[model samples]
Target chain A: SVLTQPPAVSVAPGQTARITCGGNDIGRKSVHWNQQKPGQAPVLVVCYDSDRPSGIPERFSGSNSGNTATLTISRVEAGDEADYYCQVWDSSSDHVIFGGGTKLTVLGQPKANPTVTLFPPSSEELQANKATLVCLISDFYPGAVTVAWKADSSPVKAGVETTTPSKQSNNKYAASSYLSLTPEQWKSHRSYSCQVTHEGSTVEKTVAPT
Target chain B: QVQLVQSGAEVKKPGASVKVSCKASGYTFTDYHINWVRQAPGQGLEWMGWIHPNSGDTNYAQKFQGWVTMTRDTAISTAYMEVNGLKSDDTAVYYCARAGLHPTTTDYYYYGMDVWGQGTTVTVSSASFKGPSVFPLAPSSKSTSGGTAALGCLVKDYFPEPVTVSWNSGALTSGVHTFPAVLQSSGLYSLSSVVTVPSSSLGTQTYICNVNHKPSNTKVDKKVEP
Candidate 1:
């Protein structure tokens, strides 16, 4: 009964993000904090009211007063966008309780859709029965993109490889995907399309053996 | 042991307000803290706030701070939440839950709302409405081929989206289980709860569904014969 957190908070990168946790009749107990990414497990960020966990960035700080605690991140980085939760021991019940959690988003540069191009295999490679079709995706901002492939309107499952979105020198992102196929399959006359999804828009390139 | 029973469904106009109540019994009510929760239409749970009936100290979520007020009547072991300046977004089901108690080992206490009151619904809309027509569907033995049966509670034309359906404690001899509430195309909500009983114990078991909708609290029972 000693911990409660807000639902969400947002701040631009290089700014500050502040989250508060309310306690119920809590007396002098230390509060701890955890940071969780969208898909990864939670990492301990702060402990014992004001101490930082090993490897935790120095920008994180914690404070408490009168049954309430707060966690503040100064100069928050893009990597700081995540869900935060507060934990504390309840001396009244001798149990540990955590707040519902607060989603902290560090705003970055606006997103731009990725440009996509598909490279079909050459005639000689196609005749050899083995070839690679590459899909190049570039210029997406905020570093998140999804690449998918389809064959003749159906999904392409096998012989597909995709890379994680990699940030570019310009703070945008780039990624690629490759589809390996045999000449027999390529000659079957199925249209293969590389689709890149970013910033709510999808761009696609379809190709067939020429 | 403590039990928290909440108020019924309410219909209010836009810009109007409504105050709901939860009455506690069976123990010293002030011994534990009570928290309020909200579930908007087709949405998940939100912690509104809580009040210590004894001290009147309260905490409200920042989102709810201006919209809701918490108060208590210790004389009747009751707690209340008054939602002000209602709007379409204020339509939702509200529940009162009791926080867990402290262990005997130390002054340290357990946390979180553990015991929940059947929810009370409030609708802020221009349309006038009537309470739901609750009917108990027959207990199906088809699933009992494996010593389990499905007990269905059919609530029809309930103007609002939420109604709390629960099984009375100990009503299910072997054990009790529940399903998510389903919404009909017409916008009413219905629910079915299944209880699995030992085939041999079927003859002596009776199941009951406690349907709590604002303005009316009804309980329907069914007996399963082997």
Candidate 2:
């Protein structure tokens, strides 16, 4: 385990943003911050606690208090949106620790919410002893969505395969999620649902085997 | 309600970012994978990419790498694309489409777009062009115990050259034997990737073949319990 950080946070463009990284071993000389964009490698922004890398912009700064470190961005812009990870190497602990990571969303516009629908195993699939439930999440903005499966109101954890988001001809985006199931599992549970979360809200669709 | 709608055309300067949207109705929004296709004035339809809305997982043509982003709204049954750093040759008509599942393909199938959206057009000052399968791997020999064993991924009857084959662990660890594509009697080409592993662990271990072919819309990941 390492420092603690929020999984995600949002702020409007042009506004200042402050992200905090909390850990017991925080110190002035041991904190660092890094930024990473999608499909891109991470870049060091702040090194040796509060020092900036030569190429990093001055707007990104680092600071620490008794047990917490903060990375602040001034006049945040849309291009600044990315993932930030914080790290600390305490002399006593001997091993460098890091914040799992955090996502910074530059809120230029309200994200479009997606519609969710759950489809049970098709007859063809059922006959073949291959049962799969499809959960369709469609037409959304900003490309971030989460999925969960439930059977009879309880969580179904394994055997879920979600395809990456695919672009559509109309320009929006969509994703397909398949939940593999045993025929006995479907018959045993009265209901199944695909719960989807996007843009700070969640909506789900339910289906029944019968 | 079953409908897919799109607005007017787009005119983006080179290096500009483009946003696209596809709205859905009637069917379960995430029931079918959402796909994007493009067509230039003279070129035929091209597969741009696809997304799994409920999971928000996505993959795009390598050509669109670093320039495209896809997302969806399960609550609204809509899909979107935000492609940046456009080039002049990007002019094309784009559309949102619904995809079907392959009866036996499991996780690897780009059945091609079936249902369609109204479609939108983009004319970028800069311009551009162009382009998936996984056949899981399995034990190649019936050999049972401690000695070394061979696993194979059959990649046959494809074209355009160069297929990337990778294994879960045996690729970089135990070892990999990639047989380059050989031209078959048919005009197409085929290849195979064989992995060498200690057979002792076969009973307790699992293997997967990750295959990537540029022509398919998605990479295929096949698993074997040998």
Candidate 3:
């Protein structure tokens, strides 16, 4: 499936809206997540393959396993309520896949909390070639979560995939997805996204090239 | 594209000591040579030394003479410059720089400092040694009336990897002697040469310290201690 969201994300003054996409393959090799505020062209938040770009903000992150891809963002603000997407190359079709759009709602007060914890502590992400992106969230309390990926604020060809729930040693639940694609597919695909929702809270993240 | 960004400032009193460090980023640290240079507040640059992050062969500015130590930890690719006997002159900004264009014509290679850091300046104000100093410059002395005066340069203490120190003057072959020492310290070199010209105006004479491994010769002239 071609993954993507609507070209724009508009929302009621205070309600949060979330979006998702699916991958039609197993073990996602890479994923692109991105963000776009109204008048600006979208910018990549993560190019989750093996390494990361310089000056990467901690607010965006990517994790995956098996055949699904995911992205996450924290604390939706009135400013946070922008268009988001996810993308990855479809290994089977030799093309790119993007997820549907998500427009967050800030109906109530904005959550002033930070999200997206980088793993392996001291190590910043290592840029690697031919990498499969893996997204996982474990120990989520009262789990009610949704996941999706996008390409250029649009849907990837047959690429709206979700992750499976796994158990964490810390008495919590975890879910993960994986996406595998080639470098050509990533550059051409543009952007990809992953998002999750728990109890009434929604979070999203994105990646893109150029 | 690796970049080294160093931090921290050091201050020391006379007779005390200090150590400075440099941190690296971007590329694999162990791939290149990390060198250190000392720029005394308002003085010329000195090639303090260099450390191969890979195999620790180090070279010091013979003039670094007895002041600094150079060392590197291969695993970290970090170079350390330790200054001992903190004379007021020891105050100057020390920088960690990269090695470039190694000497082409030698069994053991050496190179000139083609690149440089903006240079950090450490003010050595506590009534200590003044500023950045290098190998002694050409020394000349007066030879008045009665006979020849001896002029020689010493490498005092330095790392000598197949090095040569000779004496030279403005005019060719005259009165000169060459007494070059192959070993001065462990892997170090020192040499001195004396020449006597029947008491000419000492002010016109210049004594030079020439090392084959280094690009320029250091000269210190003799002055008739009026």
What candidate 3 gets wrong by more than 4 Å, as runs, is A1-210, B102-118, B127-226
TM-scores of the models, in the order given: 0.35, 0.48, 0.27
In terms of DockQ, the best-performing candidate is 1
Tens-place lDDT digits, model 1, residues A40-96: 434568766677856788899998888678899999998888778776655444344
How many clashes in each structure?
Answer: 16, 66, 102
User: At residue B216, what lDDT does model 3 achieve?
Assistant: 30
The order of the candidates by lDDT, greatest first, is 1, 2, 3
Best by TM-score: 2
Total colliding residue pairs, candidate 1: 16
lDDT (0-100) at residue B148 of candidate 2?
Answer: 71
Summarize candidate 2's per-residue lDDT along A1-210 as a digit string, tens digits.
358888787888888888889887465335667676653434568765577866688999988888788899998999888878785443443333457677887876567777554556655445667566656566677666778889887898876655445454444557656676788787789999898888779888787877
Taking chain B only, the TM-score of every model is 0.55, 0.51, 0.48
Fraction of the reference Cα-Cα interface contacts (below 8 Å) that each candidate reproduces: 0.02, 0.00, 0.00
Model 2 spans with C-alpha error above 4 angstroms? A163-173, B1-226
